[PDB]
Design a protein around this ligand. Structure first.
Ligand SMILES: NC(=O)C1=CN([C@@H]2O[C@H](COP(=O)(O)OP(=O)(O)OC[C@H]3O[C@@H](n4cnc5c(N)ncnc54)[C@H](OP(=O)(O)O)[C@@H]3O)[C@@H](O)[C@H]2O)C=CC1
Ligand SMILES: Cc1c(Sc2cccc3ccccc23)sc2nc(N)nc(N)c12
Length: 186
């Protein structure tokens, strides 16, 4: 198992979701970017694992579920088995990560990507260790009911470049946004 990473897109007022969808209209290349980053494994013969909350799972369009070319793991304490189309089910972030050190998964998994939502991000972000955040800054306010947790800039350094990540501003449907990578090691 290699890197642990969170990936998110967030509005200027820290919003990530609204009524079970994104706060903004669909941004095709943003979804492409998320797909490219989470799918691509820096090793041969391995796959990345994506970990997500139950509400995130059911926010993804059925036709993109499971997220293809990745091992999909859902967090829930109410479900008794993985949802239709998912691969694994865990009861805590720790268990999901323990599960990666299993004989079963140990040698099939390259990167682990936490793909949301709020509570999964917060726990991963406050836990000691080496962690990167891939943050798409959506450069407007949007009405939101679910928020990204505070990024403590004392611990998380914004990297001045990162391979395979564009630095300049993008725009789709009249909404500008930018890609950022943060790293901590504590
Ligand atoms: N990048 C972005 O902009 C992203 C946006 N989104 C959007 O954000 C919102 C997601 O919402 P959010 O409410 O934060 O939901 P989550 O995806 O975190 O789902 C919450 C449910 O997941 C289970 N869960 C969460 N964490 C854990 C855990 N550590 N261990 C066991 N179970 C856990 C609980 O389910 P149970 O009650 O069954 O125990 C909880 O009720 C949606 O609107 C979605 O579209 C989602 C991802 C990224
Ligand atoms: C899970 C996710 C997605 S998938 C998704 C998540 C929530 C609602 C969606 C609605 C339509 C299509 C896809 C949806 S896009 C995206 N972008 C970044 N930078 N980070 C993420 N974690 C996601």
């Amino acid at each position: 198992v290699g890197s642990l990473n969170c990936i998110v897109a967030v509005s200027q007022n820290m919003g990530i979701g609204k009524n079970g969808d994104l706060p903004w209209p669909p941004l095709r290349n943003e979804f492409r970017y998320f797909q490219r980053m989470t799918t691509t494994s820096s090793v041969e013969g391995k796959q990345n694992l994506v970990i997500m909350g139950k509400k995130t799972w059911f926010s993804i369009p059925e036709k993109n579920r499971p997220l293809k070319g990745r091992i999909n793991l859902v967090l829930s304490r109410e479900l008794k088995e993985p949802p239709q189309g998912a691969h694994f089910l865990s009861r805590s972030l720790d268990d999901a990560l323990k599960l990666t050190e299993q004989p079963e998964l140990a040698n099939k998994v390259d990167m682990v990507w936490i793909v949301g939502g709020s509570s999964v991000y917060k726990e991963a972000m406050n836990h000691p260790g080496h962690l990167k955040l891939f943050v798409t800054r959506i450069m407007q306010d949007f009405e939101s009911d679910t928020f990204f947790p505070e990024i403590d800039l004392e611990k998380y350094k914004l990297l001045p470049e990162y391979p395979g990540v564009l630095s300049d501003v993008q725009e789709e449907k009249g909404i500008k946004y930018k890609f950022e990578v943060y790293e901590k090691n504590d």
